[PDB]
């Protein structure tokens, strides 16, 4: 019935994003994506703590999918027979049937194909939602990602001016609830099923043990820092499927921020810290002006520094002493000061 | 002194709203409302847990009051002699005297009449506020509702276009703090006074035991699902007097959202999830496009699924396969897949 | 190299703000500020609980600094040899080097001079950020304040109209994490270093023991209530360096609110409650219409009433019975009522 060109997209692992155009003169296409569920034990902190994760495509978050307004998105969801649980997928970008969750429930050994029309622009969460208490459990076990639906003309500033990004990163933030024994040590389990009852008890107290970007504390630091150059406009897409976050680029700003994540609304300008509502994605554009290390955090600094929620950008270029300078290096306080 | 027509309004129990006009060519009236305080034990979850509630008009939330900008709102507050505590009322919509709290303190056996002018448009919280630690205790015991002050021309989209709703629902969200015994079982008390000291201890840790819509887990599910039809524009008013919430319509969107709840500000368009600040009301307009079950949740999914914060909409109509379709039902993964 | 006039500013203790112009026809200046770190035991609640604070200039919050867009801000940071720890300063208003943190680390006995250009308008947080887990610890120990960068033409309503305030107050909100012994009593320590390990354990559970304005429960109540007059436009700057807040003026409104705190964005109008993201400052303008006591709170009323987060305004003037009146004082319920 639906007679449009089909285009297969190969997803890549976050924080990177598959190749796509910003502005396009192409008409609506059927964009084909495949997501494979993988249940697996993963390391989530720098002391080696593990937990029974559940993922789309082996990563937390799941990959970012990028399409344009008016496209049709055809998603094959695969639940391999090595998994132990039923899974599904709900797209906040889609209309009807609980975002598709009601049409995509699959047992291990099955697959399903859903098609939804991208009628609403913005960044949106997708997540597993099998039903009842399984919904939060699957989500906080890692089964969430995001989709970006761009306007066909690309981004604009809400006042008639085009905005173009040179680079795009997807930072998925995950709240985790890892059970502890009586001495406070983290517990380990041989399967998701075995972890469930203890995990639910932690979840009920609503306080995460870990808050991570890209699936583990320190994932986007050190040699996995994100790269940029002075003068580049970088789009940072941030999602949180379950709990609020307050992104902040230390030493920078959000030049243009869609904190509710929807491109039909004009962005706010010059933010210090923005706010991602749990269950949503947002996006921030920033043009780097200074080289050096930047920390991207949630500005609950306890979460950022002590629970895992810090990423680094490494920015190449020349220092601008007009914007900031050390006038006098650390020196002894003058004895003749009051 | 004030010589305007008087109009008695009969309130109805949430989630329904008393009859009112959107746009009106009537001039300012004195709109007369009565609220009766009722202290009573109520069931708040599906396992039958009870707690010592305190309510306006026997319901959590208290009823929605609807007036127009420039109206005068004359509220009779009654505290029957069967109650045990003093109560009052503070309207976030009103100006002066702590929103009226300073003028409405009444002992059991008394009543009081307050008049305030509706100078500010939007949805607003009202709540009991007797003084000091009694303020949070009364509010989280259920003594809160909302008032909507419409512009005389009804809603608009902030760009010169009228917005009209076909239906309106009021969803009051309540955080509850129910004491537990040493084994974790919920405790029961013979009066609010007896529950106070144990309840305060839970409140101090800032983590609710339950988060409910319309006063109990499952209140707006099953046979009390909210009804709509494909093509209808539905206004959902959401209040939270004490704690933030992040409403989300699963399978839908917020077409027009006033998340801060004030109609002098243009709405945001096409939201996935919005944000109600604790101590505020907000409103979202959505035109249903697909039939079926929709879950309305706070998108902390732990709260939604495990603490009680899920409502259902049942929407009648015909399915639109253009917007979403199952291309291939669950089937075995092809043996010839990689 | 930089050849502009220099102007020394003398800071004052919050909630007051040093003298400054709103609109200015002066050109860019180098505005010189000095901040001295002071570690000291402080009382933070009405029962006399103490904690090992760390402050800029002896106060929580640190003082508000006010400059205009295009000014250069030259800050001398002094760490006296009586302190025990290294400190630094990061300005969310500044660009590069982690907001200046990377250029300002000083040991006890040292001082440093940083210059940054005020390129972005709004209110912004500044805070200590020495590195790693020390970042949250220093911030929640009190080392945070705010800077306001005004447009040269002063505030506007985003629709071409000037806004001018008659008075300005800075309300810094601080989440504190005070260790308890096994009976629940607060612990005391002889130094910040000794408190660290127990404090970190409380911080990890993300629930404050106290939430205060101006450094202690009741700081801005009683005789330290903030003064205003009917008809005065008052600007309230509110900062929270680590945790979200939801300001509300009980009996009032926010006439014009920049909840994200950035003056390049038009304010929202007529808010009941607004939202300060942790890691940010915001500002609200209100013109008092009624005399009397107003409570300024975070509208988590548990925090407001039971954890310390309430300030008072005392407003002088004449009561306006048109806006609000008690039509009938408390009286016995008529025996002939149903
Ligand atoms: O023996 C405990 C010790 O070993 C580590 C080393 O990386 O990890 C093990 O124990 C953890 C807690 O049960 C598990 O999460 C992990 O799967 C296991 O390899 C340390 O994290 C831990 O303290
Ligand atoms: O607005 C984007 C997109 O959503 C649709 C429905 O799929 O329209 C919704 O939003 C419109 C603009 O606010 C409303 O006027 C309409 O009633 C509502 O369904 C699309 O038609 C529109 O392109
Ligand atoms: O957190 C309580 C308590 O547990 C211990 C081990 O008994 O450490 C655990 O918790 C720490 C904080 O989450 C982790 O850093 C560590 O991996 C974990 O074993 C104690 O060190 C701590 O006091
Ligand atoms: O890119 C940051 C990196 O560059 C160095 C020299 O290679 O210094 C530059 O950046 C400093 C601020 O971080 C400036 O103060 C300095 O003047 C400038 O040359 C390194 O020191 C720095 O890590
Ligand atoms: O006997 C405990 C058992 O009975 C239930 C049945 O609905 O409710 C009773 O006990 C609860 C806990 O004290 C009370 O809240 C309730 O008022 C009382 O009827 C169960 O909820 C409970 O587990
Ligand atoms: O704005 C709605 C309504 O509020 C009042 C006071 O009751 O005005 C406030 O807001 C005006 C518009 O922002 C301000 O200009 C005014 O100073 C402030 O009191 C009403 O006059 C107005 O209709
Ligand atoms: O929550 C701790 C612990 O308490 C038990 C009974 O001992 O259940 C209580 O708490 C549950 C979660 O809130 C409720 O579902 C139930 O109504 C209540 O009695 C245990 O089941 C649980 O481990
Ligand atoms: O209204 C939802 C309800 O309608 C049924 C048939 O009565 O199916 C319709 O809705 C489905 C999506 O939920 C579509 O896939 C289907 O094609 C459409 O006919 C029921 O299956 C469904 O519960
Ligand atoms: O003896 C405990 C009792 O004294 C008070 C009186 O103000 O304060 C003391 O004890 C507190 C808890 O250790 C300390 O924070 C404080 O420094 C010390 O003077 C009461 O607060 C306390 O209950
Ligand atoms: O916008 C305020 C201020 O920020 C600067 C950089 O210091 O510009 C940023 O924001 C501009 C307006 O959005 C962007 O166009 C620009 O690319 C970005 O660096 C200043 O130039 C501007 O005055
Ligand atoms: O909070 C638990 C428990 O501790 C006690 C003293 O044992 O009081 C402490 O905690 C109170 C609430 O934070 C404070 O008001 C008080 O200053 C502190 O000592 C008990 O009173 C309470 O049950
Ligand atoms: O300014 C408030 C203060 O004024 C008094 C009289 O001095 O009363 C005025 O304010 C009341 C509302 O708070 C009005 O009801 C009253 O009519 C008005 O005269 C005091 O009662 C009040 O505390
Ligand atoms: O559906 N999963 O447990
Ligand atoms: O400025 N960063 O916390
Ligand atoms: O005023 N009530 O406890
Ligand atoms: O999409 N609902 O969680
Ligand atoms: O740097 N301070 O611990
Ligand atoms: O209206 N104040 O809580
Ligand atoms: Cu799943
Ligand atoms: Cu009450
Ligand atoms: Cu410090």
Strands A72-79, A90-91: pairing is unpaired
Cα distance between the two ends of chain B:
84
Query: What number of CA atoms fall less than 13 Å from residue A292's CA on the CB side?
Result: 20
Burial of residue C32, with CB atoms counted within 10 A of its CB: 0-12 exposed, 13-18 middle, 19 or more buried: middle
Question: Which structure tokens are listed for B262?
Answer: 């004030």
Give the C-alpha separation, C158 to A287, whole Å: 24
* Spatial distance between the Cα atoms of A273 and C92, rounded to a whole number of angstroms: 9
State the residue for tokens 């009032």. Answer: C252
Between CA C99 and CA B2 the distance in angstroms is 58
Ligand 7 neighbours by CB, cut-off 6 Å: B 47, 49, 183-186
- Here the tokens at position C19 are 């003298």
Q: What angle do CA A268, A271, A277 make, to 5 degrees?
A: 75
Quick check: A128 and A90 in contact, CB under 8 A?
yes
How many CB atoms are closer than 10 A to CB A201? 12
Q: Is A269's CB within 8 Å of C262's CB?
A: yes
Q: Which residue matches tokens 């001295």?
A: C36
Other C-beta atoms closer than 10 Å to the C-beta of A321 total 14
Cβ pair B246, C275 in contact under 8 A: no
For residue B261, report the phi and psi dihedrals to the nearest 5 degrees.
85, 15
Q: For residues A326 and A334, what is the distance between their CA atoms, to the nearest angstrom?
A: 18
Question: How many Cα neighbours within 13 Å face the side chain of C300?
Answer: 26
Nearest alpha-carbon partner for A261 in A281, A286, A237: A281
Cα B60 to Cα B11, B20, B84: the distances in Å are 14, 22, 19
Q: In what order do the strands lie in the sheet with A90-91?
A: A64-68, A144-150, A122-127, A90-91
Contacts of residue B335, Cβ cutoff 8 Å, sequence gap at least 6:
none
> A53 pairs with which residues across the strands?
A40
- Catalytic residue at A322? no
The data reach a resolution, in angstroms, of 1.7
Q: Is B107 in CB contact (< 8 Å) with chain C? A: yes
Q: How far apart are CA B80 and CA C252, in angstroms?
A: 30
C18 is catalytic: no
Q: Which two tokens stand for residue A207?
A: 């306080």
Quick check: C302 and C246 in contact, CB under 8 A? no
Find, among B88, B38, B106, the residue nearest to C250 by Cα: B88
CB A288 within 8 A of CB A251: no
Q: Which of helix, strand or coil describes residue C135?
A: helix
Q: What is the CATH number of domain B6-152?
A: 2.60.40.420
CA distance linking residue B100 with residue B103, whole number of Å: 5
Checking A162-165 for CB contacts under 8 A at 24+ apart, the result is: A162/A23, A163/A233, A163/A256, A163/A285, A164/A22, A164/A23, A164/A233, A165/A22, A165/A233, A165/A234, A165/A235, A165/A285
Q: What is the 3-state secondary structure (H, E, C) of A151-183?
A: CCECEECCCCCEECCCEEEEEEEEEECCCECCC
Q: Where are the domains of chain C?
A: 6-152, 168-316
Q: Give the pair of three-digit tokens for residue A176.
A: 């985790």
Question: Which residues, listed in sequence order, are joined to residue B269 by a DSSP beta bridge?
Answer: B256
| Dist. CA A60–CA A143, nearest whole Å | 7
Q: Tell me chain B's radius of gyration from C-alpha atoms.
A: 21
Cα–Cα dist A90/A103, whole Å: 9
| CA contacts within 13 A on the Cβ side of C251 | 24
Q: Rounded to an integer, what distance in angstroms lies between the CA atom of residue B147 and that of residue C137?
A: 42
Report the Cα B95 to chain-centroid distance in Å: 22
Minimum CA–CA partner of C105 in chain A: A330
For residue A231, give Cα distances in angstroms to A170, A226, A235, A286, B152. 20, 15, 13, 9, 50
Burial class of residue B332 in the structure, from the number of CB atoms within 10 Å of its CB (0-12 exposed, 13-18 middle, 19+ buried): exposed
Q: Which tokens belong to B281?
A: 């009301």
The helix/strand/coil state of A24 is coil
For the CA of A47, the closest atom of ligand 3 is 17
- Rounded Cα distance between C204 and C178, Å, is 12
Pick the ligand that lies closest to the CA of residue C329: 12
- Secondary structure class of A141 (helix, strand, coil): coil
The answer, yes or no, to whether any atom of ligand 10 lies below 6 A from the CB of A163, is: no
Taking one residue from B and the other from C, the number of pairs with CB-CB distance under 8 angstroms is 166
User: Which residues, other chains included, contact C150 with Cβ-Cβ below 8 Å and sequence gap of 6+?
Assistant: C20, C22, C66, C67, C68, C69, C121, C263
Cα A238 to Cα A118, A170, A196, B66, C171, distances in angstroms: 20, 6, 27, 38, 30
Find how far residue B242's CA is from the centre of its chain.
12
∠ CA A230-A236-A239, nearest 5°, is: 165
The first and second tokens of residue A39, run together, are 């249940």
- With H, G, I as helix, E, B as strand and everything else as coil, classify residue C51: strand
Residue A229 Cβ contacting ligand 3 at under 6 Å: no
How remote is the C-alpha of B137 from its chain's centroid?
A: 18
Tell me if C114 sits within 8 A of A324, measured CB to CB: yes
CA B229 – CA A49 distance, rounded (Å): 50
Strand-pair partners of B54? B39
* Residue C92 designated active-site: yes
Does the C-beta of B86 come closer than 6 Å to ligand 15? yes
Q: Around Cβ A82, how many Cβ atoms within 10 Å?
A: 11
Of C143, C199, C298, C303, the active-site residue reads: C143
- Nearest Cα residue to atom 1 of ligand 5: B185
Residues of B in contact with A75 (CB under 8 A): none
- Specify the DSSP class assigned to residue C291: -
Q: Do domains A6-152 and A168-316 have the same CATH topology?
A: yes
Question: Pick from A318, A309, A299: which is nearest to A248 by CA?
Answer: A299
Separation of alpha carbons A242 and A278, rounded Å = 5
Q: Give the span between the Cα atoms of B327 and B274, in whole angstroms.
A: 31
Q: Which of A80, A205, A59 is nearest to A136 (CA)?
A: A205
Q: How far apart are the first and last CA of chain C?
A: 84
- Of C130, C143, C135, C97, residue with least CA distance to C116: C97
Breaks (C-N over 2.5 A) in chain C follow: none
- Of C2, C294, C276, the residue nearest C122 (C-alpha): C276
Alpha helices in chain A (DSSP H): 134-140, 192-204, 301-302
Output DSSP code: residue A203.
Answer: H
Answer yes or no: A95 catalytic: no
CATH class as words, domain A168-316? mainly beta
- Residues B168-189+209-316, CATH architecture: Sandwich (2.60)
Q: Compute the distance between CA of residue A166 and CA of residue A115 in angstroms, rounded to an integer.
A: 30
Residues 6+ apart with CB under 8 A from B328: A112, A113
Helix, strand, coil percentages (3-state) for chain C, rounded to 5, are: 10, 45, 45
Is residue C188 lining ligand 6, measured as CB closer than 6 Å?
A: no
The pairing of beta strand B30-43 with beta strand B6-8: parallel
Half-sphere exposure (CA, 13 Å, Cβ side) for C35?
Answer: 34
Decide if A73 contacts A31 (C-beta within 8 A). Answer: yes
């Amino acid at each position: 019935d639906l007679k449009l060109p089909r285009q297969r997209v190969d997803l890549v692992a976050p924080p990177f994003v598959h190749v796509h155009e910003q502005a396009t003169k192409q008409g609506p296409k059927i964009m084909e994506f495949k997501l494979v569920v993988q249940e697996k034990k993963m390391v989530i902190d720098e002391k080696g703590t593990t937990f029974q994760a559940m993922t789309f495509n082996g990563s937390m978050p799941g990959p970012l999918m990028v399409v344009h307004e008016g496209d049709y998105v055809e998603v094959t969801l695969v639940n391999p027979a090595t998994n132990t649980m039923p899974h599904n997928i709900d797209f906040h970008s889609a209309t009807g049937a609980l975002g598709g969750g009601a049409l995509t429930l699959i047992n291990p050994g099955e697959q399903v194909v859903l098609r939804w029309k991208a009628t609403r622009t913005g960044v949106f969460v997708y997540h597993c939602a099998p039903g009842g208490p399984m919904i939060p459990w699957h989500v906080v076990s890692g089964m969430n990602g995001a989709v970006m639906v761009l306007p066909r003309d690309g981004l604009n500033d809400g006042h008639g001016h085009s905005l173009r990004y040179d680079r795009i990163y997807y930072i998925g933030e995950q709240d985790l609830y890892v059970p502890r024994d009586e001495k406070g040590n983290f517990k380990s389990y041989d399967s998701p099923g075995e972890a469930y009852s203890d995990t639910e008890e932690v979840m009920r107290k609503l306080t995460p043990t870990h808050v991570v970007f890209n699936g583990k504390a320190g994932a986007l630091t050190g040699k996995n820092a994100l790269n940029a150059n002075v003068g580049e406009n970088v789009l940072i897409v941030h999602s949180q499927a379950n709990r609020d976050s307050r992104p902040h680029l230390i030493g920078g700003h959000g030049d243009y921020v869609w904190e509710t994540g929807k491109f039909s609304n004009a962005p706010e300008t010059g933010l210090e810290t923005w706010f991602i509502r749990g269950g949503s994605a947002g996006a921030a554009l920033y043009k780097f002006l200074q080289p050096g290390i930047y920390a991207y955090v949630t500005h609950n600094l306890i979460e950022a520094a002590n629970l895992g929620a810090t990423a680094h950008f490494k920015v190449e270029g020349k220092w601008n002493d007009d914007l900031m300078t050390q006038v006098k290096a650390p020196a002894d306080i003058p004895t003749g000061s009051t």
